[PDB]
Amino acid sequence: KWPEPVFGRLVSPGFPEKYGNHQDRSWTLTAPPGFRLRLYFTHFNLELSYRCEYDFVKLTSGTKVLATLCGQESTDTERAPGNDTFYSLGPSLKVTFHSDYSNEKPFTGFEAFYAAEDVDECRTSLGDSVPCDHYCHNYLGGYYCSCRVGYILHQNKHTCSALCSGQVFTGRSGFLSSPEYPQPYPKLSSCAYNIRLEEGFSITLDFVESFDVEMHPEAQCPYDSLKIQTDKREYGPFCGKTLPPRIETDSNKVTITFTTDESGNHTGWKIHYTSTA
Amino acid sequence: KWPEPVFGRLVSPGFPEKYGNHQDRSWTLTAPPGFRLRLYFTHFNLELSYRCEYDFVKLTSGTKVLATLCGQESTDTERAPGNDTFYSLGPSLKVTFHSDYSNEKPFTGFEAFYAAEDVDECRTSLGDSVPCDHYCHNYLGGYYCSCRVGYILHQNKHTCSALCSGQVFTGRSGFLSSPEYPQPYPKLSSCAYNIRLEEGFSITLDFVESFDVEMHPEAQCPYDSLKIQTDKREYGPFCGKTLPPRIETDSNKVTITFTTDESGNHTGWKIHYTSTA
Ligand SMILES: *[C@@H]1O[C@H](CO)[C@@H](O)[C@H](O)[C@H]1NC(C)=O
Ligand SMILES: *[C@@H]1O[C@H](CO)[C@@H](O)[C@H](O)[C@H]1NC(C)=O
Ligand SMILES: [Ca+2]
Ligand SMILES: [Ca+2]
Ligand SMILES: [Ca+2]
Ligand SMILES: [Ca+2]
Ligand SMILES: [Ca+2]
Ligand SMILES: [Ca+2]
C-alpha cells in the first residue's frame, strides 16, 4: 500500500519565471503512518505585505497553521523561509499558494522540496512522558518496547510486568519483599509468594523496614492489594504508609499475593518471616 | 521486494539465563539499498579475556571488523558496548557469538536490538566531496539532486549544466562573458553566443578584464574550449591565463562557442564587442 518512498518538488505557477495574479493553488502531501513530512525551499521570492495578506505560501498541518510565508527576508510581522526546515504534524502537510491582483516587481515565486522521514517515538523529550516503560525501540514507520530482566511486556505492549510470582520458601526464616524494594515497585504486576513448612510449625510474619503501598482516603485499597492467605483465615488487604502489626498465624502454609495497578511510585513493603513449634 | 520495515532482536543462547560453552552462532542482518543498520545492546555480560579471545561478540560489516566485544566494562585492550550505538557499513551487518570451553562465573550473555535506518547521502562531511553539484535532496532509500536557476541537471544526474546558450546580440556594442564571471564557470556546459548585425558593419572583439580558461601544458585546450566562428574564418580554441589579442573580424555575424568539462575552478573570460563600418 506504501511500497514507494514519498518525496517530491513544489513550484509556484510559472517557475522559474514570474508568477501570475489571482492565482490559487494547493498541494496535499501525505506520508504513511509513522512518518512525517520535511519541507524546505530552494527558492523563495514573493511580494511583501502586512501579515502576507496579498501573496503568500501557507503551510498547514491539520488545524495548525505551521507557516505563512511572504517576501524575501523576514520581518516582525512577516516570515520568509530562508534555509529553514518545516516538519508536518502527523503524516500529512498542506501547502497553499495565493496571489492577489497585482505585482509591482516581477517576483519569481518559489521552489520547495519535500520528503517523508521516520518519526522517532523513542525521542528524549527532556520533560515529557515516554511511550514504553523500560526500553524503547524505534523503527521505520513505528516503534515497540521491551523490558529489563525479570519482566515481561504487559498486554498493553508498553508496561513491564514483573516476574514476581514463582517464589517458594521452605526455610525456617527469611525475607520477602515487593519487587525492586526499597525502590518503587513496578506496575500491573501480580506477585504470588508461597511459604510452605512441615506440619509441626507455625509461621510468624513481620512487616519490618518500611511500608508504603498506594492507598485511597475513602475506599481503602483499590489500587494495589497486599493480601495474606493462610490455612485458618485471610488477612488484608493492606495499604498505607505505616508498618502493619505482627501476624501470628497458626498454620504452616501461607500465600502472600500482591497486585499493582498502572501508576504510582510507592516504595513497597518488606516482610521477615519466622516460625516456631 | 522490501515492503516491510527491517528490525529485530538478538540474544545469546539461553538468554536471559547463563550461556553455554563451545557455542558458535551468527546473524546476518540485511537492509534494502539506501539503508544501513543500527544496533545497540540492552544487555551485555560476558567473560573478560585478552583481546576477547575466549568469549566474544563480533560486529563485522563487509571486510571491516566494526567491533569485538567482551566482558562487562571496557579496558585498554577489550571493549564492552555499554550504551554505544553501532552502524553498519552498507546495507548489511554480521554479528558473531563465540564462547570457549569454560566460564568461571555464570555470565548471562547479551541482548541486542537492531533496526534499518535511512542513509543521508546529502550529509555535510565538513571536508569531503558532496554527491550533487548544487542542491542535494535526501529521501528514504536514496537521494537525488537539483540545480540553481539558470541550470539544468546533466545526464549524469549530478552535474549542473548552465543554460548558457540562447543569447543573441543585435546591438552595436556590448559585453558577453562565461557563466557566473568573474566567479568560476560551471561544468559540462555548452554555451553558444550569437552576434548578428546589419550587412554594413564589421564586429571587433576585445578580451577585456581577465582570461583564465583551463589549459594543458602539452595538448593545448582539450578541457575547456573557447572558439570564435565568423563568416570569413574561425578563431581558437583559446586557453590560458592571459588576455588574447584583439580580433578584428571583417564580418557582421559571429558565433562564440564555449564548452567545459567536468572539473576545474577557473574564473573564465569576458569579451567586449564593438563594431564599425
Ligand atoms: C543555505 O543552504 C545552502 C546550501 O543548500 C548554503 O549554500 C547557504 O549558505 C545556506 N544559508 C545559510 C544562511 O546557512
Ligand atoms: C543507557 O541507556 C539507559 C536507557 O535505555 C539509561 O537508563 C542509562 O542511563 C544509559 N547510560 C548512560 C551511561 O547514559
Ligand atoms: Ca501580488
Ligand atoms: Ca518510528
Ligand atoms: Ca500502583
Ligand atoms: Ca567462556
Ligand atoms: Ca537516503
Ligand atoms: Ca573545466
Author numbering:
A (entry chain A), B (entry chain A): 2 to 278
Text from the published report:
The lectin pathway of complement is activated by complexes comprising a recognition component (mannose-binding lectin, serum ficolins, collectin-LK or collectin-K1) and a serine protease (MASP-1 or MASP-2). MASP-1 activates MASP-2, and MASP-2 cleaves C4 and C4b-bound C2. MASPs are homodimers that circulate as zymogens bound to the collagenous domains of MBL. Each MASP comprises two N-terminal CUB (C1r/C1s, Uegf, and bone morphogenetic protein-1) domains separated by an epidermal growth factor (EGF)-like domain followed by two short complement regulator (SCR) domains and a C-terminal serine protease (SP) domain.
In particular, MASP-2 CUB1-EGF-CUB2 (subsequently called MASP-2 3D) was crystallized in the presence of citrate that chelates Ca2+, and although Ca2+ was bound to the EGF-like domain, the CUB1 and CUB2 domains lacked Ca2+ and became partially disordered as a result (Feinberg et al., 2003). Because there was no structure of rat MASP-1 3D, and the existing structure of rat MASP-2 3D lacked two of the three Ca2+, including those Ca2+ that form part of the binding site for MBL, both rat MASP-1 3D and MASP-2 3D were crystallized in the presence of 2 mM calcium and diffraction data were collected. This resulted in one MASP-1 structure at 3.7 Å resolution and three independent MASP-2 structures at 2.6–2.7 Å resolution. For MASP-2 3D, 279 of 280 residues were visible. Interestingly, the three structures overlaid closely, with RMSDs of 0.682, 0.871, and 0.992 Å over 276 Cα atoms. The only notable differences were in the N-terminal seven residues and in a loop within the EGF-like domain (Thr125–Ser130), probably reflecting flexibility. A major difference, however, was that the structures now contained three bound Ca2+ compared with the single Ca2+ in the EGF-like domain of the earlier MASP-2 3D structure. In the MASP-2 CUB1 domain, Ca2+ formed contacts with six oxygen atoms in the side chains of Glu48, Asp56, Asp101, and Asn104 and the main chain oxygen of Ser103 (distances between 2.3 and 2.7 Å). In the MASP-2 CUB2 domain, Ca2+ formed contacts with five oxygen atoms at the side chains of Glu215, Asp225, Asp262, and Ser264. The firm identification in this study of the three Ca2+ sites in rat MASP-2 now resolves a key ambiguity of the earlier rat MASP-2 structure (Feinberg et al., 2003).
